Short mmCIF file of C-alpha atoms in Angstrom, two decimals:
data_model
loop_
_atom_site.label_atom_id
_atom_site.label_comp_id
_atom_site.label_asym_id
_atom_site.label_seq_id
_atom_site.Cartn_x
_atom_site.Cartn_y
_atom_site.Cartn_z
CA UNK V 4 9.55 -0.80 -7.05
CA UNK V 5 8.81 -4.34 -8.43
CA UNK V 6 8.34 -7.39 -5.81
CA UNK V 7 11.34 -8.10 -3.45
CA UNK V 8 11.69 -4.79 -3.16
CA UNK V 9 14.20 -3.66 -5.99
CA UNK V 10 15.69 -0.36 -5.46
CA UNK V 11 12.78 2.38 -5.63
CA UNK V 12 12.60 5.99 -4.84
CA UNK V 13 9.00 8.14 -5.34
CA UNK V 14 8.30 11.25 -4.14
CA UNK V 15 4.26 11.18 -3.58
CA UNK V 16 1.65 13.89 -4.30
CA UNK V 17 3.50 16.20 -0.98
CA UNK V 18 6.64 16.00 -2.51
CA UNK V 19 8.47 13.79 -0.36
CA UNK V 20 10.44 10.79 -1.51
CA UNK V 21 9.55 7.15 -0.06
CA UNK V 22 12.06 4.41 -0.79
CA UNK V 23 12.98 1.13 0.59
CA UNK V 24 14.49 2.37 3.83
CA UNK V 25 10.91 3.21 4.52
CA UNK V 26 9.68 -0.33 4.12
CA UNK V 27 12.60 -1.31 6.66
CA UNK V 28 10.10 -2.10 9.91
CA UNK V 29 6.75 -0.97 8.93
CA UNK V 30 4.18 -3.46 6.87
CA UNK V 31 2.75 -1.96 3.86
CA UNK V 32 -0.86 -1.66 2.41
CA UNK V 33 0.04 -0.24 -1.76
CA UNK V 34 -3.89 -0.41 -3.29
CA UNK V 35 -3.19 1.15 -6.97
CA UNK V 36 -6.71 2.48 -7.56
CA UNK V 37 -8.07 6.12 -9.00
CA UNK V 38 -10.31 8.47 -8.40
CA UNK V 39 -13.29 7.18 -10.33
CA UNK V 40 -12.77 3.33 -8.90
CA UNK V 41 -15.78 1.37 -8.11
CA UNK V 42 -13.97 -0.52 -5.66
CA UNK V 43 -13.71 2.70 -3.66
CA UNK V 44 -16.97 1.93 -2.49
CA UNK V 45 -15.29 -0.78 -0.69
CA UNK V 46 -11.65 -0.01 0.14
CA UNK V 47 -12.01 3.71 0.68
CA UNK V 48 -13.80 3.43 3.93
CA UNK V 49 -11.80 0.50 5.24
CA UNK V 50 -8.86 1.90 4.29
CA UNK V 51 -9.79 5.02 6.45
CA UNK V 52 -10.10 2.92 9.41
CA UNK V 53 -7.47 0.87 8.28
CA UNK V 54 -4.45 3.36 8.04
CA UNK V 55 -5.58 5.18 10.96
CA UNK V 56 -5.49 2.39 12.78
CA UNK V 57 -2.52 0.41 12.26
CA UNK V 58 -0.82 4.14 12.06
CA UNK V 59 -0.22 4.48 16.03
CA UNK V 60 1.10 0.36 15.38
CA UNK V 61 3.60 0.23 12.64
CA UNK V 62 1.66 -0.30 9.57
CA UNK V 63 1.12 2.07 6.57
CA UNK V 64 -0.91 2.39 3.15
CA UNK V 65 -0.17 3.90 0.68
CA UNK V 66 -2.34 4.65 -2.33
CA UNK V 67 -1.26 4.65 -5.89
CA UNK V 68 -3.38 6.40 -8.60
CA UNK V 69 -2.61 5.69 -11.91
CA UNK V 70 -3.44 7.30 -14.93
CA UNK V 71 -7.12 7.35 -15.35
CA UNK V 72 -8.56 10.14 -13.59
CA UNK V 73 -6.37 13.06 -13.76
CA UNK V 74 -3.80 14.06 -10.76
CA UNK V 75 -5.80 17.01 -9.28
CA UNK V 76 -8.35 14.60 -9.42
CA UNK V 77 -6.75 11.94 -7.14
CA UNK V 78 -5.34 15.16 -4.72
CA UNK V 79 -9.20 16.37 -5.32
CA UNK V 80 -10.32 12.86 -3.04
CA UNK V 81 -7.26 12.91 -0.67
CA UNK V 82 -8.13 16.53 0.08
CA UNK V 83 -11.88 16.21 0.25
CA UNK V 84 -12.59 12.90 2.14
CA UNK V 85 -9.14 13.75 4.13
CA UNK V 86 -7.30 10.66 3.96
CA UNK V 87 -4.67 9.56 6.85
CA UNK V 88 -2.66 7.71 3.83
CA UNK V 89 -0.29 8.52 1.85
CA UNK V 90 -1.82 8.69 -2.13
CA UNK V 91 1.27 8.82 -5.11
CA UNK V 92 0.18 9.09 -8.82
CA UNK V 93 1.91 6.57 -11.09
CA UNK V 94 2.00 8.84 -13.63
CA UNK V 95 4.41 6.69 -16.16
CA UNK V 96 3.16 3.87 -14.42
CA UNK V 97 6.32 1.99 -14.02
CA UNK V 98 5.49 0.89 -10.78
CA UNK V 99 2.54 -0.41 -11.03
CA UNK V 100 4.29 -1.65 -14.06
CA UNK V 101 6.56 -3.25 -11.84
CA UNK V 102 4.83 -5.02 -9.19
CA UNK V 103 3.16 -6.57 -12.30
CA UNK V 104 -0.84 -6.03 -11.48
CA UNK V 105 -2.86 -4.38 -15.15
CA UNK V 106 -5.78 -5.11 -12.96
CA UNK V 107 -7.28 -2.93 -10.54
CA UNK V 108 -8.17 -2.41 -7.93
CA UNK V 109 -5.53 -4.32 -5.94
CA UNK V 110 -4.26 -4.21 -2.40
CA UNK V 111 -0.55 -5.19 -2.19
CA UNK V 112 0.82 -6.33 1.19
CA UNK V 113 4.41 -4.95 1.77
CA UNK V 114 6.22 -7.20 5.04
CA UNK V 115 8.63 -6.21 7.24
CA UNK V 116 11.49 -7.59 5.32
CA UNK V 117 10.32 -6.12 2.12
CA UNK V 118 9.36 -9.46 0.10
CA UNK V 119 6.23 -8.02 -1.02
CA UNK V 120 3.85 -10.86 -0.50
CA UNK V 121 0.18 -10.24 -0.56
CA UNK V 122 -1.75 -9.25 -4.02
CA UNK V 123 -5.09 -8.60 -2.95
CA UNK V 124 -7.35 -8.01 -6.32
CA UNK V 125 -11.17 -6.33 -6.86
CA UNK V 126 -12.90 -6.84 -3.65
CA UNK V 127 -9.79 -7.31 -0.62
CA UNK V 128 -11.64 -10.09 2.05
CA UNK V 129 -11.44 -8.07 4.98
CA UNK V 130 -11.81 -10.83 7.30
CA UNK V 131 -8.84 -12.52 6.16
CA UNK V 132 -7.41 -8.98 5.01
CA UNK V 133 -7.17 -8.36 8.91
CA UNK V 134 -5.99 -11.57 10.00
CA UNK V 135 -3.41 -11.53 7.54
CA UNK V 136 -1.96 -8.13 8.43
CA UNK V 137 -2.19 -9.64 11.88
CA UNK V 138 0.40 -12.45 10.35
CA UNK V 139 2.14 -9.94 9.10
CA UNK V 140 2.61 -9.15 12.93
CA UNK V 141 2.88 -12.50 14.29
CA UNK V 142 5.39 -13.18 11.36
CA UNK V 143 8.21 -12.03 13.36
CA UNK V 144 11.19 -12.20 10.73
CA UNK V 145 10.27 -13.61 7.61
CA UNK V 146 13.62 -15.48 7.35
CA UNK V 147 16.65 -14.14 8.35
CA UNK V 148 18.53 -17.22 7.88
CA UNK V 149 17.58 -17.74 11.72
CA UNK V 150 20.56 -15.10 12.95
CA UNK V 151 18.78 -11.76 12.07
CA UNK V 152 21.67 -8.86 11.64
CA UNK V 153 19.86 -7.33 8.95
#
């Protein structure tokens, strides 16, 4: 839930529970945003192109609504605009609580490993947003105390 991965199991706005063993192989794009978010303007569209993309690759987002606009709302824009990504409401808000982020919008990049390393905030640079998911490729362990059996 928090960074490093702690032990975390959500069900997201389908019903169906993703948890760390998820995060085992695939790189992770979590942007907690809601419905009324000016960055949407922004991330939406990209993010579009961006899960859809990276979706036939290895790489996944997933977008977390907090408490602002209300649930329907955020299944209201997933429905509407149809979006490829998974979309959870953090309806307690424990983890976006977790990760530690108050501000919003922000794009967190989940490796490989599950270190959590990225914290994209406001506008993500998609330049360098690309490149680095790129790294996240070219980044082919991230440490496993060079004999990987994990």
């Amino acid at each position: 839930d928090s960074k490093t991965a702690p032990a975390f199991s959500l069900p997201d706005l389908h019903g169906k529970t993703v948890s760390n063993a998820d995060l085992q192989g695939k790189v992770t794009l979590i942007n907690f945003w809601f419905p009324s978010c000016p960055g949407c303007v922004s991330e939406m569209p990209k993010i579009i192109k961006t899960a859809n993309d990276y979706k036939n690759k290895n790489f996944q987002v997933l977008a977390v609504a907090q408490p602002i606009d209300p649930i329907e709302s955020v299944r209201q824009y997933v429905k509407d605009y149809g979006l490829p990504f998974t979309v959870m409401y953090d309806a307690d808000k424990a983890v976006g609580q977790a990760f530690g982020t108050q501000v919003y919008p922000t794009s967190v990049l989940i490796g490989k490993k599950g270190e959590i390393l990225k914290t994209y905030v406001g506008e993500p640079d998609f330049g360098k947003l690309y490149q680095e998911i790129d790294t996240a490729w070219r980044n082919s362990d991230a440490e496993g105390h060079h004999h990987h059996h994990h």
